[PDB]
Design a protein around this nucleic acid. Structure first.
Ligand SMILES: [Zn+2]
Ligand SMILES: [Zn+2]
Ligand SMILES: [Zn+2]
Ligand SMILES: [Zn+2]
Lengths: 519, 522
RNA sequence: CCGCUUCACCAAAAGCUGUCCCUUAGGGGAUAGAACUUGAGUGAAGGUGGGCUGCUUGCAUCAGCCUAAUGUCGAGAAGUGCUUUCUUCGGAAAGUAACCCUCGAAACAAAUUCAUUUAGACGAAUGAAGGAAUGCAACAGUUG
């Protein structure tokens, strides 16, 4: 099962109507061009670099040109009068808010009525069959006769059946969590197996076209003063449907910043469109980020069974020591990296050193009579307990690396060899931690943890890492470690590739290189 | 006309009687005399409170290296003797399990009454319910249920007043918010008794320079069924009028007497002093638990009080304004007398940055840090440091608010003008929102500054907030060039007018706009 | 050690200027200048550099105490997941114990009990009942 977040700029009614939209958008754009001959000098971005005569590019957010490209609902209303089946952005966003508040009201009121029905009249003793009877006989009919698409009512039946828990609240340990109606989409479920193909998603220019079936939604004569939204009907699909199709824009915003694309999900959407990857859920709500809380995205939810893979020796991992981290892990194929935390061990050594230097100043003439026997008594118990802490921390690190590789499904990791490891000046060790460390138990515990998950070890031990780039083995021999402390450990810039890289990840990439062999 | 407040104080012990308390006070005096003549000057640590009355020694100590005060401490076998001697007397363990049962039952009845009233308003009533219907259904359901379980009327009227002050009807009418429901066991019992004119409330008695409150209560009895599923439901709570047993508590004040402000008229010690002196009749009594300290939680107590407003020289002809700054957190601006206030002395954030580094290194990889023992323990260090940092933040905010109020009383402004909240979250010239991503809650800050200016009768006017960082203040010349990235790339300079050459602090302009009275409110 | 503080000295990847291109939505790359700044750089000094209790809280100091504590564990089985059995729509029951599964566990000091090798000290406890600093600054709170 998965949840996949895509965006929408506009509906897609037909071909020629959105053609007319683009054409008259460009027509107002060229009217803004030919009118602004030093009437404004903001030089909207794009508009200046394409064909214009303006002075200064301003940041493309408060300039006059895109407001002209921002179309008007007078023109949209005249378009609606030529073509009544050409619906637009405000119409679909009103329908979004209307269905969202509809489902939120029906959901919350049916929850509280179920809770009351079970626990105060019937005294808390019934079955879940009565819950399903309330579902089918009350809220299925309510959502199917408030809007005549019964599949949405079945999806709400599924949603409330998941969201209402009888046996939890039987002990009254908590309460029913209610929303502020900004956290609530609409189900729009179809069948999983075969017959209901699912939302008829097609391809477009690096983007998609959805098809969501509906009815007629006659705009009512009485637009209610108390109720600012409910004026539609959403008539029967079995009598007279009219499926709304929308343009699914693939722009994923990165935390209120510009337009970006993430491509770990586009292949999954293509797998939906070929015929496999049988999704059944289109959640329609706002985004959870800044300024996407007003623009309506879409959420495709999918289900796949647990198809296990295991590990394979084609994937070849690497484990290297770090300078900010005590260790790092790297895979030669994908990005797929992993740091190891430092701060807990750092604060622990800080407290241990502070305790030691406290005890080494309030003892020097204070505990008399014994000599340095009972002066040395409390530091030893500290050191056994510190050693047990270091052992448990190393076991936690080994289990973390094992979980990392098992999620990444790596068959074998090439781990850098031990005597070569300890004789390294670039490590996090031998800089602050001088030499006081049990390296061999760490290696043996890592190997035992990995072989518990069944992953072999290689001992490849190259001649010179930490300055050879993974893209091209230039052997950038100006990376002296003295130079690195002289530049306070800067990035690794492979100058022949113009390859600026986090300075230790490439060192971990050299250990994952399978072309060099073991020892 | 009046401003509400609460006072949080700690319960020391259940004050029992006059005779039994005379017995225990004389027993403390007896132990003091016994260890007075037991020590034939094997001691030189007579504490300061003892050198005046019994001094055969050398020096003074810090009132914890004493022995006579240590002799005043009472054991627990003598309390078992007092348990056997007086079965009518009350003691901590019984009162604590009473209050735990009361917290559990009050939370359950509060949840059941909230969903009951939501049902009888919106489901069966089809949403057809004005506010008078809601009060009618409050009195119809919640008071009847609470008097059906608790034979007290005080707890019943308290639950009705608490649910009335919690069921915010208009937001759940137009679907604007979420239905409340509690989760925590730290749920305070409301305890309302009225106070208007021919009634007083709870009988505050200053017996011997201390504080004794008197909660009316019935004669509880021991249960018979003790089910294994729910342990704490183990009492009966019989009727006040058939069998009154007033639980009377003692609240600590010895720490408050040693403050700088105790012989004054404005610090909260003077409100406690007037509560001792008859007036400031309380009405609303919360019984919380404090920090979990040493296997036995110290139950706090909250005392409502309707203080009259301090006059303190108010004349709303004078007008001042405040902002959010970039060098100071808050800057205050006087319209005409050219007076400015700022606060630019604290080292608070390396502290909150070490905790946030610790939270992030716990949070982002929680998978093996402390697993196998629930999620209440898995976030246990985080909860202690978040509560302590929010307490530090609230106390710094209240110190800021008192400095602001002292400034405005020093410059005699009768009414202050403050920004709209919907703009304050979206105001990126702030000293906040650039150092801090999602940390600070500003609604509580504004509530504290609103209350602290209300404490001198200075009113707070919501204003038109639009583009205040660039509109000038000496003359309204509308210098709309002073953009955000323009401000960053000029190294955060002075704002200067295009034609006044008004080179002054930009945030000080951003409040001297609001300090000019010509802005209409909203 | 210190990604602790102060002082002094020192280096510039990160920030600015300026240049140039590419879409210029997000911004991406390099070359010369300065130190506001930075530094997990150097030297002198001191300093829990984590907490707990001290009677509502915070900072600083002080008295005593805990710390492997960002740790490690105790008990369970309300819930999540998983196995088996049934109606086979949909859930139940038995477990299992992996779980952002549930409840918990360190911290002033008098005094008391029981026990320990020989009145000293340790252990297990006991557990509220004004036994507790100084100085500044405040001190409506819950719920949503
Ligand atoms: Zn523009
Ligand atoms: Zn390379
Ligand atoms: Zn004394
Ligand atoms: Zn101006």
């Amino acid at each position: 099962t998965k949840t996949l977040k895509l965006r929408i700029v506009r509906p897609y009614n037909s071909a020629e109507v959105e053609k007319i939209v683009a054409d008259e958008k460009n027509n107002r754009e060229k009217i803004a061009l030919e009118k602004n001959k030093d009437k404004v000098k903001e030089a909207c971005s794009k508009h200046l670099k394409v064909a214009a005569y303006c002075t200064t590019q301003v940041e493309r957010n408060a300039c006059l040109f895109c407001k002209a490209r921002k179309l008007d609902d007078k023109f949209y209303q005249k378009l609606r009068g030529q073509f009544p089946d050409a619906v637009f952005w405000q119409e679909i966003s009103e329908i979004f808010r209307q269905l969202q508040k509809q489902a939120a009201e029906i959901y919350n009121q049916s929850l509280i009525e179920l809770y009351y029905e079970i626990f105060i009249k019937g005294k808390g003793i019934a079955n879940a069959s009565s819950v399903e009877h309330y579902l089918s006989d009350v809220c299925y009919t309510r959502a199917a006769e408030l809007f005549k698409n019964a599949a949405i009512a079945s999806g709400l039946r599924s949603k409330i059946k998941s969201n209402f828990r009888l046996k939890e609240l039987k002990n009254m340990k908590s309460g029913l969590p209610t929303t502020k109606s900004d956290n609530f989409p609409i189900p729009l479920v179809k069948q999983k197996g075969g017959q209901y193909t699912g939302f008829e998603i097609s391809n477009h220019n690096s983007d998609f076209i959805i098809k969501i079936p509906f009815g007629r939604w006659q705009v009512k004569k009485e637009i209610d003063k108390y109720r600012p939204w409910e004026k539609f009907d959403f008539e029967q699909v079995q009598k007279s449907p009219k499926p709304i199709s929308l343009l699914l824009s693939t722009q994923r915003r990165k935390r209120n910043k510009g337009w970006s694309k993430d491509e770990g999900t586009e292949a999954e959407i293509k797998k939906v469109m070929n015929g496999d990857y049988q999704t059944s859920y289109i959640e329609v709500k706002r985004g959870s980020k800044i300024c996407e809380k007003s623009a309506w995205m879409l959420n495709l939810s999918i289900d796949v069974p647990k198809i296990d893979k295991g590990v394979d020796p084609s994937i070849i991992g690497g484990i290297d020591v770090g300078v900010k981290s005590p260790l790092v892990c790297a895979i030669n194929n994908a990005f797929s990296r992993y740091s190891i935390s430092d701060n807990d061990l750092f604060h622990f050594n800080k407290k241990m050193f502070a305790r030691r230097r406290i005890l080494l100043k309030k003892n020097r003439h204070k505990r008399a009579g014994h000599g340095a026997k009972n002066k040395l008594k409390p530091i030893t118990i500290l050191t056994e307990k510190s050693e047990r802490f270091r052992k448990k921390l190393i076991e936690r690190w080994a289990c973390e690396i094992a979980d990392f590789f098992i999620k990444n499904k790596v068959g074998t990791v090439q781990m850098e060899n031990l005597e070569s490891m300890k004789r390294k000046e670039d490590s996090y060790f031998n800089i602050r931690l001088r030499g006081f460390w049990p390296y061999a138990e760490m290696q043996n515990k890592i190997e035992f943890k990995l072989k518990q998950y069944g992953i072999e070890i290689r001992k490849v031990a190259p001649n010179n890492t930490s300055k050879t780039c993974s893209k091209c083995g230039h052997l950038n021999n100006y990376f002296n470690f003295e130079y690195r402390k002289k530049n306070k450990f800067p990035h690794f810039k492979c100058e022949k590739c113009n390859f600026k890289e986090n300075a230790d990840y490439n060192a971990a990439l050299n250990i994952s290189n399978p072309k060099l062999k073991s020892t």
